[PDB]
Amino acid sequence: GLVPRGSMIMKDGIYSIIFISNEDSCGEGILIKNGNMITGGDIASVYQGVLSEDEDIILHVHRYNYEIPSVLNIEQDYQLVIPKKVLSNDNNLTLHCHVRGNEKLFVDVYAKFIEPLV
Amino acid sequence: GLVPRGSMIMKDGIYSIIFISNEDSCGEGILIKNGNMITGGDIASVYQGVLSEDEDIILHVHRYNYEIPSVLNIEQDYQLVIPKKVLSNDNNLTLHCHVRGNEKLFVDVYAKFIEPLV
Numbered sequence: 147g148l149v150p151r152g153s154m155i156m157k158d159g160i161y162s163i164i165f166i167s168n169e170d171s172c173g174e175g176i177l178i179k180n181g182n183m184i185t186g187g188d189i190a191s192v193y194q195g196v197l198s199e200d201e202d203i204i205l206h207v208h209r210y211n212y213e214i215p216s217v218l219n220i221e222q223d224y225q226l227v228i229p230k231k232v233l234s235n236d237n238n239l240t241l242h243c244h245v246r247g248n249e250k251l252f253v254d255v256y257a258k259f260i261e262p263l264v
Numbered sequence: 265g266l267v268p269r270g271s272m273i274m275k276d277g278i279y280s281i282i283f284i285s286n287e288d289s290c291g292e293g294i295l296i297k298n299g300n301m302i303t304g305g306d307i308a309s310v311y312q313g314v315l316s317e318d319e320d321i322i323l324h325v326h327r328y329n330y331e332i333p334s335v336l337n338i339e340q341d342y343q344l345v346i347p348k349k350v351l352s353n354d355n356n357l358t359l360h361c362h363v364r365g366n367e368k369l370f371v372d373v374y375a376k377f378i379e380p381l382v
C-alpha cells in the first residue's frame with residue numbers, strides 16, 4: 147500500500163510513467179533518477195529537475211516535437227512544481243503536479259520502478 | 265554532414281531517437297548520456313549501457329511492457345552491441361546495432377540532440 151513519503155526517498159533507477167492532465171489527456175513516458183537529478187521524456191517533450199529539499203522542486207519541461215499535442219496544450223516550454231511529499235511504495239508512487247503559477251493546470255502521475263542504474 | 269567519430273564523443277544530454285529493425289518495425293524513444301553512462305527507453309522497453317573504449321559497448325535492453333510488441337520480437341531481455349564508431353555531427357548521429365550473438369537481428373538508429381543536462 148502507498149504511504150506519504152518524501153519524493154527524495156525514491157530508489158535510483160529507471161521508471162515507467164503514466165499521466166493525465168486537467169484537460170483529460172493522457173501520456174506515457176520514461177523517468178530517470180540519479181542522485182537528486184531527474185531526467186525523462188516522452189514522444190513530444192523531455193524533462194529535467196533536481197530533487198529540492200529546501201526549495202520547491204521545479205521540473206523543467208521542454209517540448210521537442212510540436213507535431214504532437216501536449217497533454218496540457220501549452221504550446222511552449224513550461225515548469226511543473228513537484229510536491230515534496232508523495233504516496234509511494236518501494237516500486238510505486240503517484241503525485242499531482244501543477245504548472246508553476248497556475249494550479250488549475252496539472253497532471254496526475256503514476257510512476258512504476260523498472261530497474262536500477264548500472 | 266555526418267562523419268565517422270567515436271560514439272564516446274557524443275555531447276552529454278538528452279537525445280530523441282528513432283529506429284527500425286531487420287523485421288522492418290519502427291520505434292521511437294528517449295536516450296540520455298551522462299559520463300559514459302547511457303540510459304533510455306520507450307513505451308515498451310528501457311536500456312542502459314556504459315560507453316566502453318577498451319571493451320565492446322553492451323547495451324542492456326529490458327522489456328517492461330509485454331502488452332506492446334518489440335521492434336525485434338524477442339519477447340525477453342537481450343543485449344545490443346553498440347559500435348565503437350558512428351556517423352555524426354554535433355547534434356546528430358546514426359548507428360547500426362545488432363543483437364549480441366546474432367548479427368541478423370539488428371536496428372538502425374538515428375539520434376537527435378535535444379538539450380544538455382542541468
Ligand SMILES: CCCCCC(=O)OC[C@H](O)COP(=O)(O)O
Binds near residue numbers: 165184188215
Ligand atoms: C518526478 C515526477 C515526474 C513529473 C511528471 C512529469 O514530468 O510529466 C511530464 C508531463 O506530463 C509532460 O507533459 P507534456 O508532454 O504535455 O508537456
Ligand SMILES: CCCCCC(=O)OC[C@H](O)COP(=O)(O)O
Binds near residue numbers: 309323334336
Ligand atoms: C547508444 C545508441 C542507442 C542504442 C539503440 C537502442 O537502444 O534502441 C532501442 C531498441 O530498439 C529497443 O528495442 P525493443 O523495444 O524492440 O526491445
